[PDB]
């Protein structure tokens, strides 16, 4: 099967809302050891974001019932909810370590050191899926995936501050998720607000650098930064 056919199947799987097949198709494209275009980069991201997103929503629903059923005391019913919450947990973790495998072995590796837009994209993507692992992890297992998530984000933030425009959608989106990581995972609203506000201030200071094409995506992320700021302060 040709590479163009795999990308066509991914676009076809997207319209048919079959996001599991879309991820398998874009994984096959990734495994060709060739770099991904800006379109194929978003196709892979959209696919796995929907696959892991479906199991993120299921876990939060079951985990909430698990904390709600703990007052029942029925050991036969509590162990059944605990086992189900664990099964969705394993599926969520397998998807994450699948994306991290593609990122470390193929995507970030085959990234030319001169292409900073893709390196920041993949490093942010790497920090996203380690954050999804920390959403369901406890104890030292959580401390490990939190440390890995901070490392991928911090490495992406330093590259974006030196070779990318403050109004670039990828640098803006990275600071949005990074600030969310400090708020939802580390519970640091002061650190979350300082990062979200700084990226908002840097973009405003260089608002003339808004690209004639990507300004629509840049302004939406800037709105999301102030929406989180007003929500956290």
């Amino acid at each position: 099967v040709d590479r163009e056919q795999l990308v066509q199947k991914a676009r076809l799987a997207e319209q048919a809302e079959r996001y599991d097949d879309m991820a398998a198709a874009m994984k096959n494209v990734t495994e060709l050891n060739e770099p991904l275009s800006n379109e194929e980069r978003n196709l892979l991201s959209v696919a796995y974001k929907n696959v892991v997103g479906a199991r993120r929503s299921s876990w939060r629903v079951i985990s909430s019932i698990e904390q709600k059923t703990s007052a029942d005391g029925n050991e036969k019913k509590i162990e059944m909810v605990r086992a189900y919450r664990e099964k969705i947990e394993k599926e969520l973790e397998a998807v994450c370590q699948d994306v991290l495998s593609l990122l470390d072995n193929y995507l970030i590796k085959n990234c030319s050191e001169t292409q900073y837009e893709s390196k920041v994209f993949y490093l942010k993507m790497k920090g996203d899926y380690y954050r999804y692992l920390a959403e369901v992890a406890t104890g030292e297992k959580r401390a490990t995936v939190v440390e890995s998530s901070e490392k991928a984000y911090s490495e992406a933030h330093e590259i974006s501050k030196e070779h990318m425009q403050p109004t670039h959608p990828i640098r803006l989106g990275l600071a949005l998720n990074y600030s969310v990581f400090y708020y939802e995972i580390q519970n640091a609203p002061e650190q979350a607000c300082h990062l979200a506000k700084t990226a908002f201030d840097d973009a405003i200071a260089e608002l003339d650098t808004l690209n004639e094409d990507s300004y629509k995506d840049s302004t939406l992320i800037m709105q999301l930064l102030r929406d989180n700021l007003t929500l956290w302060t």
């Binding site: 949005l176 998720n177 969310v180 708020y183 999301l224 929406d227 989180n228 929500l231």
Partner: peptide
């Protein structure tokens, strides 16, 4: 509330 990028 999952205030991340969509």
């Amino acid at each position: 509330v999952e205030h991340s990028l969509d």
